[PDB]
C-alpha cells in the first residue's frame with residue numbers, strides 16, 4: 001500500500017482496491033530501470049552515473065514482504081558478465097513458473113536451455129557471417145537508394161524515416177523474402193502495432209501482421225528461397241514449427257527492425273556531432289580499423305538486458321542474490337564505466353574497443369552480424385555521400401524518447 005500523503009510519484013502511488021501487489025512491484029522496477037537508462041545526449045543520465053559509483057550491483061527495489069523478492073541492477077562490467085554468463089539465472093522464469101509453457105513461440109529471449117539451445121541452433125545458420133557476406137550487395141543497394149532519395153529531396157531531411165527506417169524496413173523484409181509489393185503496407189501495419197494509442201487497435205494490427213507472417217511462413221518453409229524460412233525449413237523440416245518460425249521472423253521485422261532504425265539514427269547524429277572523426281573514416285578508413293566497436297561501445301543503443309531470475313542463491317561480485325530475485329544488466333554502464341573522462345569520450349582511433357552492446361552469454365544478440373553489416377555499410381556510405389552533413393538547426397536539442405536510445409527526429413542538412 002503506497003502512502004500518497006508522503007510522496008509525489010504517480011507510478012509509485014497507483015492504488016485501487018484489489019490491485020495486485022506483485023504486479024505493482026514488477027512494474028515499478030521496470031519503470032525505475034527505464035528512467036535510469038534515458039540519455040543525456042549520448043551520455044548516461046546523472047542518476048545512473050551516481051548509481052554506478054555505489055558499486056557493481058545495487059538494489060532497484062525490494063518487495064513489501066518479509067523474505068520477498070529483490071530487483072537488482074548490475075552496472076560493473078565484472079558483475080554484468082557474471083550474471084549474463086551464469087547458468088543460475090533464468091530468462092523464461094521471468095514470464096511464469098516451471099509449469100507455464102512458452103508464451104511467444106520463437107521469442108528466443110524467453111527460452112532456457114535445453115530448448116533455447118536447440119531452437120537457436122536451428123535458426124543460427126541464417127544469421128551467420130557467411131550469410132551476411134551474401135546479403136551485403138543487397139544492403140549496399142538499399143543504402144544507395146536511400147541516399148539517392150535523401151539527396152533528391154534536398155535539406156533539411158529527417159534522418160529517422162529517411163535513413164534509419166528507409167534502410168531497416170527493406171533490409172529486414174528482404175532477409176525474410178517479403179515481396180517488394182507487400183513491404184510498405186507491412187511497415188505501416190507494424191507502425192500501428194508499435195504506436196497506436198488504442199490498445200484494441202494495436203492488437204488488431206499485431207494480429208493482422210502475425211496472420212500475414214504465419215501464411216508467409218507456411219508458403220516459404222518448404223520452398224527454394226534464400227530467405228530465413230527456406231534456409232531453416234529445408235534444413236530442419238518438421239523439427240521447427242510454423243509458430244517458432246513465425247516468432248523469429250516477427251522479431252526480425254518488428255522489434256529488431258526498430259533497433260536497427262534507432263541505431264542508424266543514433267549513428268547519423270554522432271556523425272554530425274563528431275564530423276572531424278568521421279572524416280577520418282571516409283578519407284582514411286585503414287587508419288581506424290576498430291571504428292565500429294568504438295561506435296557500438298559509445299552509443300550502446302540497447303542500454304539494458306531483459307531481467308534474469310535467480311534459480312538458486314548466487315554470489316554476484318560481493319552480494320548475495322537470493323533465489324527468485326531479478327538482475328537487470330546495464331549494458332550502458334558496462335560500456336561507459338569511466339564516464340565522464342577523456343578516455344570515455346568517443347575516440348574512433350582507439351585500440352580494440354571491447355564492449356557488451358550486443359549482450360553476453362547464451363542470449364547474446366543473434367542478429368549481431370546483421371546489425372553490424374547494416375552499420376558498416378550505411379555509416380561510411382553516408383559520410384562519403386554527404387561530407388558536409390550537419391544539423392539543420394544546431395540550436396535545437398534532439399528529442400529523445402523512452403529507452404532504448406530513441407532519436408525521435410533528426411533534421412539534417414548538407
Ligand code: HEM
Nearest residue numbers: 108109256259302305306357358359363364365366367371
Ligand atoms: C536486425 C538486426 C537484429 C536482429 C535480427 C537481432 C536479433 C536478436 C535476437 C533473436 C536476440 C535474442 C537471442 C537469444 O535470446 O538467444 C537478440 C538479443 C540481443 N540483442 Fe539483437 N538483433 C538485432 C539488432 C540488435 C541491435 C542493433 C542491438 C543493439 C546493440 C541488439 C542488441 C541485443 C542485446 C543486448 C541482446 C541480449 C538481450 C538479453 O540478453 O536480454 N540487437 N537479438
